[PDB]
A paper describes a structure:
The multi-subunit Type III-A [name]-Cas effector complex (Csm) exemplifies this principle and is in addition regulated by cellular metabolites such as divalent metals and ATP. Recognition of the foreign or cognate target RNA (CTR) triggers its single-stranded deoxyribonuclease (DNase) and cyclic oligoadenylate (cOA) synthesis activities. The same activities remain dormant in the presence of the self or non-cognate target RNA (NTR) that differs from CTR only in its 3′-protospacer flanking sequence (3′-PFS). The single-stranded DNase (ssDNase) and the cOA synthesis activities reside within the Csm1 subunit and the RNase activity resides within Csm317–19.
As all Csm subunits were present immediately before making the cryoEM grids, the reason for the lack of Csm2 in the 2.9 Å apo complex is likely due to its dissociation from the complex during plunge freezing. Nearly all particles that went into the reconstruction of the apo structure contain no Csm2. Though still not clear what conditions led to the capture of the apo LlCsm in two different stoichiometries, it indicates instability of Csm2 associated with the apo complex. In either isolated or the CTR-bound state, Csm1 is active while in the apo or the NTR-bound state, Csm1 is inactive in cleaving non-specific DNA. In contrast, when Csm1 is bound within the apo-Csm RNP, it is immobilized in an inactivated state.
Residue numbers in the entry: 1 to 81, 92 to 111, 116 to 296
RNA sequence: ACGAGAACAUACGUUCUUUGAACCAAGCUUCA
């Protein structure tokens, strides 16, 4: 298991339904879509989808990190006996679970709002506004992968000089990436456990959804939007809405998701990575 | 096949109008 630490050199915009509103981090849907667009840029989207569908690449949602501290979302535990807390460090999960344990503050950056206009010559200009998020100086995001492949690294390097998120051609989203294989996180992931914490925006297939929802504390998340290409349907069109579990969810039974197809009435398919990525705890 | 594509926070706008560096003031005091 390896890491992809994303040190950002620019404001980002990772909107949820907006241009004016943004979140601090992105998801596996967006990174899979970005890598698929970089694959069709260099003609390897048949290879990349065959790698991703056969579980040769498996990446979680991008998660925050401050100095030598990797963070994950606050796992929804259904324990019996920190509402403003949202991110607990991944190494501190055992003694966060063993008792009511806050050691240091969580600061990643702060949100912003860019004020832009759409200038007209002989007409009054149109204001609009882009909500952004600027990271702090020695912070960023990381993505957990395992058994990395040279195609994944080539596509990541091509995505590095293209932009991640929204409004990327208009000033945002540039970053640099690094692998930096760690030893503590891989030992934390290799250990089994009775309860497993989801880490990507997954959705089980229709023959395992009942098995997945047994002793489950989940949160559904609507993950859709408009199709970003040029060869799809000669006008802007919204893909199929897919409701996946949120990345902080916690399950008893394991599952492997699917790369669902959300675009069918077009010249090329549109995919949505809802494969499952788990972390075992006790 | 990234809640995404496209989109200048842009256009018009004199740091400008008043007002004396004036008023007071033996180159003079003792010298065949």
């Amino acid at each position: 298991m390896k890491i992809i630490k994303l040190y950002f050199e620019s404001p980002v915009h990772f909107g949820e339904k907006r241009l004016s509103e943004s979140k601090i981090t992105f998801s596996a849907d967006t990174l899979f879509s970005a890598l698929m667009i970089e694959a069709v840029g260099l003609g390897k989207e048949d290879e990349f989808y065959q790698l991703a569908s056969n579980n040769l690449v498996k990446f979680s949602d991008a998660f925050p990190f401050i100095d030598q501290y990797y963070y994950i979302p606050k796992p929804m535990f259904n324990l019996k006996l920190f509402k403003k807390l949202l991110y607990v460090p991944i190494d501190s999960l055992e003694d966060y679970l063993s008792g009511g344990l806050e050691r240091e503050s969580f600061n990643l950056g702060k949100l912003a709002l860019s004020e832009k206009v759409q200038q007209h010559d002989f007409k009054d200009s149109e204001p609009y506004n882009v909500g952004t998020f600027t990271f702090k100086e020695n912070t960023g995001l990381y993505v957990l992968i395992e058994q990395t492949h040279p195609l994944l690294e080539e596509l990541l390097e091509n995505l590095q000089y293209s932009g991640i998120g929204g409004k990327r051609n208009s000033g945002y989203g540039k970053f640099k990436f690094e692998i930096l294989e760690d030893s503590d996180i891989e030992d934390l992931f290799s250990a089994k456990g009775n309860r497993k914490i989801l880490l990507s925006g997954a959705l089980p297939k229709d023959a395992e959804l009942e098995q997945a929802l047994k002793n489950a504390s989940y949160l559904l998340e609507r993950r859709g939007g408009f199709v970003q290409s040029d060869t799809y349907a000669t006008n802007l069109v919204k893909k199929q809405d897919l409701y996946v579990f949120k990345s902080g969810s916690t399950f008893e039974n394991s599952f492997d998701g699917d790369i669902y197809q959300v675009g069918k009435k077009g010249n090329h398919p549109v995919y949505k990575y809802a494969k499952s990525f788990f972390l075992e705890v006790s």
